[model samples]
Target: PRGSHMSGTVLINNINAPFLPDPVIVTGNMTLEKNGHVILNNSSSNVGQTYVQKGNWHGKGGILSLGAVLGNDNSKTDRLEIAGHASGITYVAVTNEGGSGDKTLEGVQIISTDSSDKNAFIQKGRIVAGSYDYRLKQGTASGLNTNKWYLTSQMD
Candidate 1:
């Protein structure tokens, strides 16, 4: 579904889930409940794609992939949260010079309970705030306990 608004509790465990034609806007508090074994196929085949917006995503236990922009405007007070006990790897990529700005990950918690040390990986395509080009903004990472937060180029 393109330009769709999702509400209430949404369960996505199907492997053949349809690709969203356009950016889906999320209103209210939305929860994405899924067992950690689910796999999303080729959801990233399009350019400048956005999966969801202004929603809270939670995983019960599987792998989730985001090939689209997944957040809201910086002006909005409502925060976007991504949290789950997902013991697997989560991959996020923004391709084709997509513009991701103002909106930032409010709260991100990817729980990796396995023996592997790696947690989550993110590939920011092209982030812009204004006319300035801040390629690869500097940031910091905390220990294995707290939620990760990043402060962009302005702090540099």
Candidate 2:
């Protein structure tokens, strides 16, 4: 059965209303012809998942977990910044039109238990294997070190 569509501004702070930002009360997929916005502010570990587009992502929680994450290649600035306990496995896939693909980190703090995953930063689809400080050689960053990371390739 088809459901109702929610269109308009919504409040998500202090008020603490279930109808405000309840997982149940949600709008259908919104297509961004040019840009979109999504913000997540949770001090407790996130038990669920929420997807967003905008190349830019900021996580300021004490701990965040995404059993698994698959990132879409929407903008060249597809960046992920973290502060605090940013754990769990996150699968990132990057695809750039023409030639090789690359990404830059603005100011992210990463400290994960899995060093293998801590190095998930790739410059143009090439995994920045080794250490987080190494990836910094290519991208700009501020705070923390060693963030789990890996690369995913495209298949025909």
Candidate 3:
């Protein structure tokens, strides 16, 4: 399916959420019901939200979207673009294939979300752009990225 509101529940186990073409969108609440596994082969906007309540919703480059390099606008980094809130915990594994990495005061934009909840996603292991070992962190109340989560190399 190219587009699914996911208003109800979608079992990511055994079943598949993969779609044809290069674009897809989930404009409603998407719940990966506990159990087997499903693969969302590429980029699909979960404009509403995503819930891995209890299951191994594992994958690489999440939604399989965006470029590898963390560009000036973070358009080159591997991150999730969500317009709504997040739920539960889904550990994401990161890697750097090209580029030397990026250094920034805001670090790299990881999960760009609207809601301020910071207990949704976490890096599985060491997330390094190059030489710097980045750590998961949430943004301030009112800054550049309010109510958002990112990976910061500096302590805060």
| Top-TM-score candidate index | 3
Clash tally for model 2: 13
Would you estimate the TM-scores of all the predictions?
0.28, 0.23, 0.55
Compared with the true structure, what per-residue lDDT tens digits does model 3 show for residues 1-156?
122222232222122234212223345444333331223312323211222211112222222212234322252444454665555554554444354555556656655566644456656566566566666667732246655666566322
- Candidate rank order under TM-score: 3, 1, 2
**Order of all candidates by lDDT, from best down to worst?**
3, 1, 2
Q: For candidate 3, give the lDDT.
A: 0.43
lDDT of 3 at 47: 17
Model 2, 1-156: lDDT tens per residue? 122212332222222243222232233222221122222323122212233222222221111222111222221122333322222223232222222323333421221222223423323223321221112221224333334232222322
TM-score of 3: 0.55
Task: Give me the runs in candidate 3 sitting further than 4 Å from their true place.
Answer: 1-23, 33-67, 70-75, 140-144, 154-156
* TM-score quality measure for candidate 2: 0.23
Full-model lDDT, candidate 2: 0.26
Of models 2 and 3, which has the larger lDDT? Answer: 3
Off by over 4 Å in 2: 1-76, 99-145, 148-156
Worst 10 residues of 1 by lDDT: 71-80
